[PDB]
Design a protein around this ligand. Sequence first.
Ligand code: MET
Ligand SMILES: [Co+2]
Ligand SMILES: [Co+2]
Ligand code: NA
Length: 263
Amino acid sequence: AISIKTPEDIEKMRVAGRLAAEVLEMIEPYVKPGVSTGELDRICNDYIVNEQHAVSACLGYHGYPKSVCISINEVVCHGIPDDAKLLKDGDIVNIDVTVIKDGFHGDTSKMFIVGKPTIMGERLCRITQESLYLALRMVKPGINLREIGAAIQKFVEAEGFSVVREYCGHGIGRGFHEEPQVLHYDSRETNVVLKPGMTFTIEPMVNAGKKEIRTMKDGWTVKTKDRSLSAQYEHTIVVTDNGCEILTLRKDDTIPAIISHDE
Ligand code: MET
Ligand SMILES: [Co+2]
Ligand SMILES: [Co+2]
Ligand code: NA
């Protein structure tokens, strides 16, 4: 079943969502050539534990050994921070943060460009964020989740990119991954009509080349089969009476916090 959050639950998710967003705001200035992904992870964990008094939902989860996921270039998702993996000028990097506070999860990710913005990968990142924003603008009671995945795929493909099929957004709350699965492509047989108080993520993974992926020697890391660049952005939301509220909004987002579809 998909749980409907109570008003108190939603308030706790506002807090957890803000904390996850804060991690991404904090880490940004550290993302520069020469830093290791292991160091970035250490800085994130320190902040989550010691400044936010929260805990990483990733660390220990199905044995995952780090506190955030950091995915560079052709890595699609679930890249494992490593002390020896150094960022280079021109890299694109996803950092994906999930924190638990007061029993509730907040889950969000964004892309960072290492160095100047006008590089191979910039347009991929921008379009990936735009695909997330397109989807967020659709969320309201009475829409079928089917429609949202179809819209993401149509947009991404019209931009000359492909959508990763094997990974999806998810319900979230007291649990990390709850019902429903939020597909980012058109699947005629879905699904699920949205209702106020549902909380879930949208997190499209978009490849510059072909859609196919390969899962690596470590039980987590996913790369593009063609080693083309891949980008992802993620937000956690709550469905409101006439739209949604974006719980993991950051200072650099360019979409409104609260989206309303009423006249
Ligand atoms: C190591 S679990 C990482 C999960 C990821 N934060 C997600 O959005 O599902
Ligand atoms: Co995430
Ligand atoms: Co997620
Ligand atoms: Na990538």
